[PDB]
Amino acid sequence: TLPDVEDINRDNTMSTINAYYEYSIDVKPGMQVGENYITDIREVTNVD
Amino acid sequence: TIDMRSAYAWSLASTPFITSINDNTFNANSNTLEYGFKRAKLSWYTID
Amino acid sequence: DGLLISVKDKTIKVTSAKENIKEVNIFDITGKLIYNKKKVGNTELSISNLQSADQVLLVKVNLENNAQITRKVIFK
Amino acid sequence: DIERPITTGVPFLLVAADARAAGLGDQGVATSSDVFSQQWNPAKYAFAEDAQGLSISYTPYLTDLANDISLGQVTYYNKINDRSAFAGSFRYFGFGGIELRQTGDPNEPTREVNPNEFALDGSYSLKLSETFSMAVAARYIRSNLKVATEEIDASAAGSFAVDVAGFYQSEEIAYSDFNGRWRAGFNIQNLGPKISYDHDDLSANFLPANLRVGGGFDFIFDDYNKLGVSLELTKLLVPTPPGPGTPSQSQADEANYKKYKDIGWVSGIFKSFGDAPGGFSEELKEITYSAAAEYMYQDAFAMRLGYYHESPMKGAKQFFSLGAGFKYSMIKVDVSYLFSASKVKNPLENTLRFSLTFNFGDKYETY
Ligand SMILES: CCCCCCCCCCC(CCCCCCCCCC)(CO[C@H]1O[C@@H](CO)[C@H](O[C@@H]2O[C@@H](CO)[C@H](O)[C@@H](O)[C@@H]2O)[C@@H](O)[C@@H]1O)CO[C@H]1O[C@@H](CO)[C@H](O[C@@H]2O[C@@H](CO)[C@H](O)[C@@H](O)[C@@H]2O)[C@@H](O)[C@H]1O
């Protein structure tokens, strides 16, 4: 029900600054732990 | 932890920069309709 | 009776009308102290730090006049 | 500590709801007939001394923290004849009215929700022989303990259960020093389909099927003093979840859990006897016990001591229980307190369970 406003933080003001930090991850079929910020992988075999 | 996977708390984002503030990859520096020429479709939700 | 508890989104805002908050204790349905602020002395409280493994959590606040009031809230 | 506890839905069906039985170490399958004898053994409702009775019982949860979080019970029994009796009980565990606020405006309509869990059951008890009786009970259990939010459905989960009970009470037999009385009872409870809280047939939880077998003896002195010593054994009829593994590393656990969850309740009742690496010596561990002694003076004062012990490897709820009961004219008031003796924090500690029963109607003689 809220109107679509170009104001995400709801401070009534639309910020136009672009000062941020950028992180990235890859999405590949053969990802493994130890690289690409992967810390754990859980495999499930028989899912109903 | 601060939970950030709420569906209703995310909204359509602005055109980002991929390398730096001088990186015109997705036409983020454009001041015309070309600013939005690289926006592909994205649906974010939680299955009801 | 003077307090307006509110849980908007992962936060518990506590406001005491015409009184001063002394201590706020937050309990889960198990009875574990998931949060404790022994020293505030302010009208407005904003926890915004609960883990809340369940939904219903119990908060107990006492004012400067030692008014133990407990109000069950659902974590959102 | 607790190794592989049994994961069954609606656990509140296994919690004592009346002060009298809770003061006896949570046993009522072999004690004297009373109005509260619906959760434990309806088969002795035919042995009740009065025509009809009603009872309200209260068990507070987290007394030190807040009120309105409690388990209440309303029971009503009525015997039309000396051989048959109809009873009906309603247990309700609730956290009380909880307001939902997301705004600090004083003028703001607040939605009030009460996450609850109730079970309404009705039982018919027929006295087959002069000293033996049977009873069949049907129970409907609904759980609405969740609050509706975004991407979360608070639809209530409902299920049905069938209870079969039997109670034997011999006549007053005289001995060298006293004229005691023998009682025995068995009860199979919560026989029904799985209850699914997620409303999905793939994710369904077994009802807490239970088997209680109890026996007791009453010593009678001076015709106005009674001492009833009773012992009850309780065992769940649900298969034990797999532990380390019973066939990579997580694949065995996943396969064992999938095999365990893909078991029908009818098959699971029979699979309860076993399904573990241990033998009969380790299978005896699954049976919890409760021993109680109740002293009755003038049929108006009751002092109850009880000791309820579960296995340390499952449940681990060992405690003592004190209880008192007073009947003025037709109203019996029962109060019970629990002294925990286990390493786990019992949620019933520092809780004085209460019960209030009104008995009315004609009086039936007891054989
Ligand atoms: C699913 C449950 C349904 C609810 C059952 C309520 C039954 C109410 C009957 C009142 C009662 C039971 C005590 C119940 C109290 C528990 C209340 C719980 C409150 C919880 C917070 C109290 O009666 C006692 O209390 C006294 C009141 O002070 C009475 O005094 C006097 O009281 C007044 C004259 O009686 C005077 O006006 C007052 O001047 C006096 O002082 C005394 O007569 C007596 O000691 C007496 O029961 C008797 O009344 C009849 C009426 O038809 C009932 O008929 C039954 O109805 C159906 C049964 O439902 C059955 O189907 C039906 O077969 C059966 O014919 C029987 O029961 C009967 O035995």
Structure report:
The structure is cut from a larger assembly and holds two copies of chain A (48 residues), one copy of chain C (76 residues) and one copy of chain D (367 residues). With 48 residues, chain A is low in regular secondary structure. Chain A contains no helices and no strands. In chain A, 0% of the residues are buried. Helix content of chain C is 0%, strand content 50%. In chain C, the strands form two sheets. Chain C has a four-stranded antiparallel β-sheet, with no helix packed on it. Chain C has a three-stranded antiparallel β-sheet with strand order 1-2-5, with no helix packed on it. Chain C is globular, with a radius of gyration of 11 Å. Chain D has 367 residues and is mainly beta. Chain D contains four helices and 17 strands. Chain D has helices at residues 19-22, 250-261, 265-271, 280-283, and strands at residues 50-60, 70-78, 84-94, 98-100, 111-113, 116-126, 132-144, 157-169, 173-174, 179-191, 210-221, 225-236, 288-297, 301-309, 319-327, 331-340, 353-363. The longest helix of chain D has 12 residues, at 250-261. Chains in contact: A-B, A-D, B-C, B-D, C-D. Chains C and D meet through strand 1, strand 6 and strand 7 of C and strand 4 of D. The complex binds Lauryl Maltose Neopentyl Glycol (LMN). Lauryl Maltose Neopentyl Glycol is lined by residues 54, 56, 76, 330, 358, 360-361 of chain D. Lauryl Maltose Neopentyl Glycol binds next to strand 1 and strand 17 of chain D. Chain B: It comes from Flavobacterium johnsoniae. Chain B: This is Protein involved in gliding motility SprA.
